[PDB]
């Protein structure tokens, strides 16, 4: 996509922990958190944080059951987020490449949490612009 | 200030919990997390997350002992962050106004964590531009 309000949100599993990964579809920019387990409460909290930072209009996920809880729907309601039903390619590219980077830095960090954020940093800063540069430009332009 | 790489980071206490608050000085944009207690490990983690999202050059704090730990210095080292020694006004305005907003929404949220992120959202979206709009514009412009 190119629409600036669209995000993808998914969980991946690593070392018995859960990594919640948000991707800004238009730029490739990522934010991540390591959580104990997949719960509606954790997803809701993450969504509220994201919406306070970026103009989040719609969110897509590869696992629709992720968004069925009361708690998630309440967070979407309050923040004015809708579910994206307009995406039936480069999003599976982010989550596998993110896991590669995590693997690369894993030894230089003590805790998995740190390695994840190191990987996010590397991903977003890599340039011919970076994902970090692209998201800011897209959101700035859009008014 | 107006320099786009400068952030202020401080902890405030509420309901026996700790709120870590980052302010982008030039825009007034805020990010926050609720943590169990003030530790170097939590500060380091927060800094790494922030640096992966924004071009963080320097960080100031009202409590310098906050940044003395090995773990914090290692996070600053890896992310290429320096301590800001160039600030000897509107930053104490954010942390007290943030507490006001938190108080306003506190009953509409179950957990303090949620109320904090609700307050962050309100603060950043309030317009004549919002803090959220200003940070993106400043970072976009700056190249």
Residue numbers in the entry:
A (entry chain A), B (entry chain A): 55 to 142, 149 to 187, 193 to 208
Text from the published report:
HIV integrase (IN) inserts viral DNA into the host genome and is the target of the strand transfer inhibitors (STIs), a class of small molecules currently in clinical use. Retroviral IN proteins consist of three well-defined structural domains: an N-terminal domain (NTD, residues 1–50), a catalytic core domain (CCD, residues 50–212), and C-terminal domain (CTD, residues 213–288). The CCD adopts an RNase H superfamily fold and contains a D,D-35-E motif that binds Mg2+ or Mn2+ ions, which mediate DNA cleaving and joining events. ALLINIs promote IN aggregation by stabilizing an interaction between the catalytic core domain (CCD) and carboxy-terminal domain (CTD) that undermines viral particle formation in late replication.
To assist our comparison of these complexes, we determined structures for unliganded CCDF185K and CCDF185K -BI-224436 forms at 1.9 Å and 2.1 Å resolution, respectively. The CCD construct used contains the solubility-enhancing substitution F185K and exists as a dimer in solution. CCDF185K was concentrated to 8 mg/mL in 20 mM HEPES•NaOH pH 7.5, 300 mM NaCl, and fresh 1 mM DTT and crystallized using hanging drop vapor diffusion in a 1:1 drop mixture with a reservoir solution containing 7% PEG 8000, 0.2 M ammonium sulfate, 0.1 M sodium cacodylate, pH 6.5, 5 mM manganese chloride, 5 mM magnesium chloride, and 5 mM DTT as previous. To prepare complexes with BI-224436, the apo crystals were harvested and soaked with 2.5 mM BI-224436 for three days at 4°C. Apo or soaked crystals were transferred to 30% ethylene glycol in mother liquor and subsequently flash-frozen in liquid nitrogen. In these reference structures, Trp-131 adopts a rotamer where the plane of the indole lies perpendicular to the long axis of the α3 helix. B. Superposition of the Cα-traces of apo CCDF185K (salmon) with CCDF185K•BI-224436 (blue). The two chains with an RMSD of 0.3 Å over matching atoms, with only slight discrepancies in backbone atoms observed across the α4 region (residues 138–155).
